[PDB]
């Protein structure tokens, strides 16, 4: 059923990509026992974009410890856009609200262990490797294009610098931030990432505690609350499963233990066309429909 | 153990009420089988205040239907104070972000079924009655006091009226709104309301579907995302249990099925509240439970 | 010339009333020597609306003294709409920015001498009488309509109450505020009002110091800076003369002493159709054109 | 008397520099006939900082023309801090409100004529030269220091670039911007610049039209409405003279024709500045003059 059903909903939702800003749609669901299913363009490589924020938040937590990270960044939804800047001036002293939005993610990248973008990125990549099992390939072309026009982000970054919420130089931090966003991946890779988090940091395939439980838990908490930005409320209400998105069109979702996926799973969706919030338009229609039918809500 | 650990914990966190604006602290946990445990001021009656926004919301949905409510109110966190008015003007057209914040709940009040505040209130008291099993008692004194000085809320109400997000007269809506907030309850009552919700609307004591499953589910979603206002994030991250509070000191919380392996309802009372409007001691108490028994749904 | 010229520009600008939200346009310029000119619909009665704010600000200043008024209300432009409310919550303790916007004007009305709307309004009317020479007639119909739908204003009012910036009950204050806005008048009446202010509180016709110099000066200062709300910057730049507007379409302008109007004057314009800022669309095109040609700018 | 009253006043307000973040205070008033009076630290050189936004603005207008500048920047007060970024995001599309605030002046810098910061700077130094009568000297040390830590301003610049309100590269614009701010001057120089402006651009010492009348008029309008940022209101109400300040302590002001019956230029220096970025002592000094001699154009 699952397999058959995904093939149906993918083909049923593919068309709404004319309402976003493209007609590609892929999904991959993975279980702790290795069972894997997919439909659509699930093996097509795309940059993780904002999905990498979950990982860097993890890395920073593992290196510095949750306390150290919480001093620098909060965990509250902002109600604003992922790249909004107003709360950095308004809300004094100006601490970023959470690590999912651009501002907090920029802060996180700045507190990653290392003295240079390379040193920090090395630590991030190594962790990434403990998850997907290989080193992250990067999309130089995308990183280049992005490094040349990351205006909004440099503004955010520079503003954070001033209010002293950047444990590193601006351009240095941009590089870290822009590279992680350029880390290539497929629905298969992010699906496996969710499956690991779904099981509180335990890799069910490799039987090894790759991420500390409390950290993986904290990560999930933030996905639910800020993972989909100022659309998270909707996701919680109509999907009710931790999820994170990437402007490139990806969505990493996951279901914690306890008919279908009774043992939980990691979800990986790809849908280039994105909505006003920056979340995959059809990717979201596919995730909502799934959760709806199989009743995945953790509420 | 739970019964005992609760007594220890309450006695332990009671003294922290000195940091908020109060020395009381009470709890009550209820299970589907009927087992109930409590410690401290669990029987001291208190107004539900905002804890009622969840029932009025649930009621609007039962009457109007979810589709109708979602056209009048959204379900997004504002990242602002519960009584913040900012977004009613800045975010045009001006649809209130969610029913948990004062702006949304007022909108919700205006859409309840009825030609008057009385009619809208009776429908509310009835739903609230198929939950706690009795007509709710209203703290007349508290209401009269709030009625005279609910300025902030009146501004909110009036602004919503201006942006056409009130399907009722302002004063009529204030009435309905300030009335539910005044409804009286003890940890036992909200604990029950929380158990019913935890079980997707099935009342585990009368064995009956008292709330449309999808509606109860939606309420729980809102609780987790906005129930504790601009403090909800920390709550999902440090307690991880859907919760809802009232400035009177109440906290309603619940654990979905799978200690308390079959879910549960939580009722907490702690008059002293923090900067976000959530009970200080009550909040600490819920956190300890959450940590120690691992209730987090994450 | 002046007379002839006004008749021309009125007829040239009348048509642009199809771009506002009506085709009426009137003007009346008055000098200290009694010389008066007008064109268009200058003798048509309209409610002063926000123009009354200048008067109540005056009254309050005369009764309480500028210090007392300045404690309750500031004199800074807000950059927001005349009926905006955000700064009442954002900017703590939440003091209104100026007496020209709705919020500050509501505060002013609340500090007018009296215990009731009647007692306060009596004081305001009496002052109004010392200016126009008669008691203000009121447009009951407009006041009624307005009292039934002044939502935005009650919100403002009620919010001020909470932050304690209203020296009176909300509804009481609304009545005061809503009545002054309903005070009827013609271009002739407001023109004479400007002429008095133009001469620092001296009635040039009646030869009597009706308004204290420092108060009339303060009033002018605020017209220039906040009189046209978030359009005052434009007026200062393209008109450069103190001015106040009323949503009903009126504009009261004035030129202080030192070819045309060398001895100064008071200007009264009426143009029902108003722009996005709430300022008469054609009334403004007429005031700009005048200032431009005769070079009225005080800069 | 003026020469003397100035000495008394300066000596009198000097001591108030303890309340701001400095003990210096200097002034210089210049008339069309060439009479010049001064008291205190009037010859102590200081960077113009924001006082230069008026000349760069005047220059952009001379080169591009007013119509072109007004499509890139408005002339409205923001009611916010000079270095506030808020409106660049909230007020869409995001056109900076006015050239006096940091956001606008940066926009202005980007539109000056030129293919590089050097070319845009030379055009600026030339205009500034047909005013003070000499190539402006740049405080290299101060500039180098600001260049390394102008974060806030960099954020502003970068946001404008994002909303397409910069007709130049960010760093190139920062350069031009941080360079003019570093231009050196004494009360005498800004006083002169103020006299020229007071006379609608006619230089009363060389008898020549050095600034298009309409342009000089527009500059004076902006000075009165935004020159003192979110403190301009108080200034129109308590000084009533078009003024412009710099965080270095400078204040430029001027009185249009009809003491000083033929207008005048004012140059003030007072390092200690208030919460709005305007000189504390300098501000008090200008106010006293304004009151005592009745300079108010209102």
Curated annotation (Swiss-Prot), chains B, D:
The keyword Amino-acid biosynthesis does not apply. Coiled coil: none annotated. Gene3D superfamilies: 1.10.1500.10, DD-peptidase/beta-lactamase superfamily. Its EC number is 3.5.1.2. The keyword Hydrolase applies. One of its GO terms (molecular function) is glutaminase activity. GO terms for biological process: glutamate biosynthetic process; glutamine catabolic process. It is an enzyme of class 3 (hydrolase). Keywords: Hydrolase. Substrate binds at residues 50, 102, 146, 153, 177, 229, 247. Pfam families: Glutaminase. It catalyses: L-glutamine + H2O = L-glutamate + NH4(+). NCBIfam families: Gln_ase, PRK12357.1. Belongs to the glutaminase family. Homotetramer. PANTHER family: GLUTAMINASE, GLUTAMINASE 1. This is Glutaminase 1. It comes from Bacillus subtilis (strain 168). The lineage of its organism: Bacteria, Bacillati, Bacillota, Bacilli, Bacillales.
């Amino acid at each position: 059923n699952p397999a058959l059903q995904l093939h149906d909903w993918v083909e049923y939702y593919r068309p709404f990509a004319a309402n976003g800003q493209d007609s590609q749609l892929g999904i991959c669901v993975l279980e702790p026992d290795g069972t894997m299913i997919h439909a659509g363009d699930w093996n097509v490589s795309f940059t993780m974009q904002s999905i990498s924020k979950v990982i860097s938040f993890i890395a920073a937590c593992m290196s510095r410890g949750i306390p150290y990270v919480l001093d620098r960044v909060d965990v509250e939804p902002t109600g604003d856009a992922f790249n909004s800047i107003i709360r950095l001036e308004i809300n004094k002293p100006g601490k970023p609200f959470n690590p999912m939005i651009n501002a907090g993610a920029l802060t996180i990248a700045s507190i990653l262990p290392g003295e240079s973008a390379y040193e920090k990125l090395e630590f991030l990549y190594s962790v990434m490797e403990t998850l997907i099992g290989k080193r992250p390939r990067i999309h130089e072309e995308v990183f280049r294009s992005e490094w040349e026009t990351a205006h909004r982000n440099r503004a955010l970054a520079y503003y954070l610098k001033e209010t002293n919420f950047l444990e590193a130089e601006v351009e240095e931090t941009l590089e870290v931030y822009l590279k992680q966003c350029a880390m290539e991946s497929t629905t298969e890779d992010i699906a496996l990432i969710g499956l690991i988090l779904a099981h509180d940091g335990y890799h069910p395939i490799r039987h090894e505690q790759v991420i500390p439980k409390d950290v993986a838990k904290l990560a999930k908490a933030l996905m639910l609350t800020c993972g989909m930005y100022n659309a998270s409320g909707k996701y919680a209400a109509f999907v009710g499963v931790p999820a994170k998105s990437g402007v490139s069109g990806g969505i990493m979702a996951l279901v914690p233990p306890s008919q279908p996926f009774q043992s939980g799973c990691g979800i990986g969706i790809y849908g280039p066309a994105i909505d006003e919030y920056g979340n995959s338009l059809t990717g979201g229609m596919l995730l909502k429909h799934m959760a709806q039918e199989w009743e995945l809500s953790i509420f």
